[PDB]
Amino acid sequence: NEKLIEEYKYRLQKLQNDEMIWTKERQSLLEKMNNTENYKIEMIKENEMLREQLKEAQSKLNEKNIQLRSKEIDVNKLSDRVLSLENELRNMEIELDRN
Amino acid sequence: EKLIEEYKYRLQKLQNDEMIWTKERQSLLEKMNNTENYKIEMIKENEMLREQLKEAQSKLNEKNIQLRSKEIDVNKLSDRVLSLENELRNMEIELDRN
Fold it and tell me: Hey, is the C-beta of B65 within 8 angstroms of any chain A C-beta?
């Protein structure tokens, strides 16, 4: 049965050679799956950084609007003062020409 | 004879592993496609957040101009009040001289 045993050993050798091939290409897929995952983690890390910067940008956006309405009241208070002083300046100028 | 049956079972085992690997390889590729889709979704979320920040920063910068412009506007009115208070005393001097 020398020929029969040889045929078995030749086909066992081929499949045991393929055992290494499957192990090689699964290592390659594991390496590729890790790279895709590590890039995904990097994207999420940047997304959390962008979310925090967006929260800060909206926090300053609100604070500037509080500062804008504060200066708007300052405009309103001074403009009312300007008109009041101009009316008083008019009154003195009327009293001056009277004398 | 018992030797041949051992070779036959061993060959059948390795032929089964080859067929099962074909399913395992397909399973890894389906898992690779899913991970790629999550990455794609993360990239889409990254560009969305960048455009939202770019709009927020441009909206913040214009209000920095508006606030510093109102700063000058307040100063103009503040100096106008002091000018009218100065004119009133000059009028008070002219009134007292009569």
Answer: no
